[PDB]
Amino acid sequence: LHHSEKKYAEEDQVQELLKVLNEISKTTLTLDPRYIWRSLKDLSSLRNQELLNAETLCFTVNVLYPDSSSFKKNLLKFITSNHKSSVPGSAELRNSYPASFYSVNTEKKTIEVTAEINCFMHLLVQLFLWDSKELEQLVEFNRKVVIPNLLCYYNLRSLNLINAKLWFYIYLSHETLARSSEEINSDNQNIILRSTMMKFLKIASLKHDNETKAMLINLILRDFLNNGEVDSASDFISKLEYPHTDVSSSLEARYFFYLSKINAIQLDYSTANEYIIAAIRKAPHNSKSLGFLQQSNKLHCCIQLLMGDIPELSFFHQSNMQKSLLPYYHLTKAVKLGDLKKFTSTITKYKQLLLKDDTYQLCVRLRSNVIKTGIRIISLTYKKISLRDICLKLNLDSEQTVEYMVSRAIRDGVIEAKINHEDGFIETTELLNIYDSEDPQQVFDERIKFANQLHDEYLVSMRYPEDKKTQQNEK
């Protein structure tokens, strides 16, 4: 019963291992194993539940263990292991074959098979940790191992894609440990974690690997947002070390999502508005990306309110996420209607929900935007309006208070009007007829560059699938 269970999953694990084993030996095929490793994460997660944990026990016995002797015992000690044929050397799948990692040449140390075996061994260990949700000592014990090993081992172009997915598990398992319980040893692990990301990023710069460097950047930018220090992130994004070539579909929208949050407190909404829009188009529409689309669309609606312009409220309805978008509808309604008491009572009840996404701090500053939008609505209606007519509609304090607030709207060129103190009315200075200026040419010059930018993208992509088929023989 239990004997046939261990041989079934181990044969499928070697079958998938031999596919990427022979491809990395000749030249560089690494593009092909990268596609296989994408599905390997999903196929292994479903397979870990079946046949219990015994699929990874005989896999270490098959190959040679450089560091992994005590790692499997320590990983299986917390679950109160039940020992069945636990003596090492029970299952031998090698039997002296070239693709089987021939033993005599391996035991005599005349050849080194540890490079591809050990780096792949750490991948299967991190998968069971996230599947079984093993925390506390098991998280810190594996961190003391992989990091010193990556410093001694020098990865080639194909080998840099192995640990690229391991850095995500180190940061993911660390954040779940801090939020679960607060202990004195929690931040001691984060200090070394923050210093380790900067040391390995220095080496990956010369490797020119797209997935390796881009995976760390999105993990480093998230750490800066938790501490709330832009000075570390400001110079970090100015170097432009983020590879734009191949992020696949995972890192497309993750990079632009951080720039929208950083520039939100920079008081520049021109560039931040484009980053949040590009994050929506680059993010997949599937169910696994719904967690990202939930937080991203909530940030886009908050940026528009900070710009002074009322966005489209139809997104709060036709979308299927409106259950979580209900608190944000009353915020825009209070800013549009200009009611002072409605905005104060709206943020009071939903303050608990705004604490999770940390958007309540931006909602406090929406108190000013209620007046910013209210002035824009009343100004467009009446070109010449009396000074006391504004205080009657918005129920303001006095005439000296509104005189200061209207002067704040034309600061950046929003309203573009003038205040006449002696005449007693505010007159709009916008005569339209802007076509006589150079403004139409300013937009058309970018459309030509944007059209040729899409041309330059299509300019050079054809031959990539044609390299394999034209070089190989065809019927």
Partner: protein
């Protein structure tokens, strides 16, 4: 089933008179003794709540509002099982004998079609479309398919269900598209625009109503002048004032329609006053419009306040085109508004980009914003011009 649908429709919202719901309730109890209206009244309490929903004797035990006259007494309660035996036990046994004796084909199909009309008055909709499906396989020509599309259309008319009914209305024309005569070809497109009025697609669905109601009426459910109020209000609503002179004010059917009854007050009082550019007498005609037309009519009250926001901005927009600058004493001191009350109407229209107007708060000189040679060639070109790269890079940047 239009009598119980149109008269009892006042059970939704009536702010005018109390006897309006009382007088209309007499027709509900009068027509229910012949054919069973029970599934209609059960849905009235399940649609709108905390108004008339407490008038039903047995749904949940409640008593509220002004209406004790709508209910099922101990008579109709005993008649509930009497109508079920006649509409199910009596009819199904007669049709079952037809399948055993094998008499005719289309005659057996018309039996299930006629029987399917009773399920609309039963209130079980699973067997309503099932019996129509049995006659669907027996239907050969288009003669038997006429009553099929009518019974399916009643499912959304009788039960006020615009969700599952519109799928069956479109499934008949999509599977086999013929249409026969142009009369039925407009019928498949008419039922398409009916369920679109519930979601309020505005001029898309409403443009077909003025064409169909001015030519032919089904005459089985209602009369020609009873539902003519739907096209009278939506006639000037959807159509611009430029084409009202060659269509509405001069029409063979409409000009003869106003002489039938005085309950329209749209194609005559509102059309002539709007074409004459006189808003002094035009506005008081709107006082009897919403009360005596929009409220009693079904599909018109589905909009109600949705009419004015489009109409109130249009009536002043046509006046702004006839003068470069107007005067406040004409708007404030004469026709439709006072001085201070003017801020509520045009105040919310301009920030919505519905119209461009300027009002003076000192001298009282109204100013009109004219685009002149700009129009859509310069300003509006920039707005809709950005959609070129927006829709192209939306799904284009992700390749496949």
């Amino acid at each position: 089933n239009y009598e119980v649908s149109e008269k009892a429709f006042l059970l939704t919202q009536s702010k005018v008179s109390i006897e309006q719901r009382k007088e209309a309730a007499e027709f509900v109890l009068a027509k229910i003794k012949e054919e069973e209206m029970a599934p209609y009244y059960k849905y009235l309490c399940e649609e709108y709540l905390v108004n008339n929903g407490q008038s039903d004797l047995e749904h949940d035990e409640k008593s509220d509002s002004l209406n004790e006259w709508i209910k099922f007494d101990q008579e109709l309660y005993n008649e509930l099982c009497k109508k079920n035996e006649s509409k199910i036990k009596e009819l199904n046994e007669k049709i079952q004998k037809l399948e055993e004796d094998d008499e005719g084909e289309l005659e057996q199909a018309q039996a299930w079609i006629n029987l399917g009309e009773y399920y609309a008055q039963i209130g079980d909709k699973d067997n309503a479309e099932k019996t129509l499906g049995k006659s669907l396989s027996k239907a050969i020509s288009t003669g038997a398919k006429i009553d099929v599309m009518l019974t399916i259309a009643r499912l959304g008319f009788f039960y006020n269900d615009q969700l599952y009914v519109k799928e069956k209305l479109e499934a008949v024309n999509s599977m086999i598209e013929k249409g026969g005569d142009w009369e039925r070809r407009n019928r498949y497109k008419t039922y398409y625009g009916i369920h679109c009025l519930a979601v309020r697609n505005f001029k898309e669905a409403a443009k077909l109503l003025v064409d169909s109601l001015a030519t032919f009426t089904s005459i089985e459910l209602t009369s020609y002048e009873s539902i003519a109020t739907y096209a009278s209000v939506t006639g000037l609503f959807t159509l611009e004032r430029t084409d009202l002179k060659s269509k509405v004010i001069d029409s063979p059917e409409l000009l003869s329609l106003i002489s039938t009854t005085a309950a329209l007050q749209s194609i005559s009082s509102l059309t002539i006053s709007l074409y004459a550019s006189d808003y002094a007498s035009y506005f008081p005609y709107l006082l009897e419009t919403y009360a005596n037309v929009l409220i009693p009519c079904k599909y018109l009250n589905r909009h109600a306040d949705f009419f004015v926001r489009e109409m109130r901005r249009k009536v002043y927009a046509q006046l702004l085109e006839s003068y470069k600058t107007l005067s406040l004493k004409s708007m404030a001191s004469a026709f439709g508004v006072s001085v201070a009350f003017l801020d509520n109407d045009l105040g919310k229209f301009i920030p919505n980009k519905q119209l461009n107007c300027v009002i003076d708060r000192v001298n009282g000189i109204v100013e009109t914003n004219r685009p002149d040679n700009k129009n859509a060639q310069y300003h509006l070109l920039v707005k809709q011009g950005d959609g070129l790269l927006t829709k192209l890079q939306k799904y284009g940047a992700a390749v496949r």
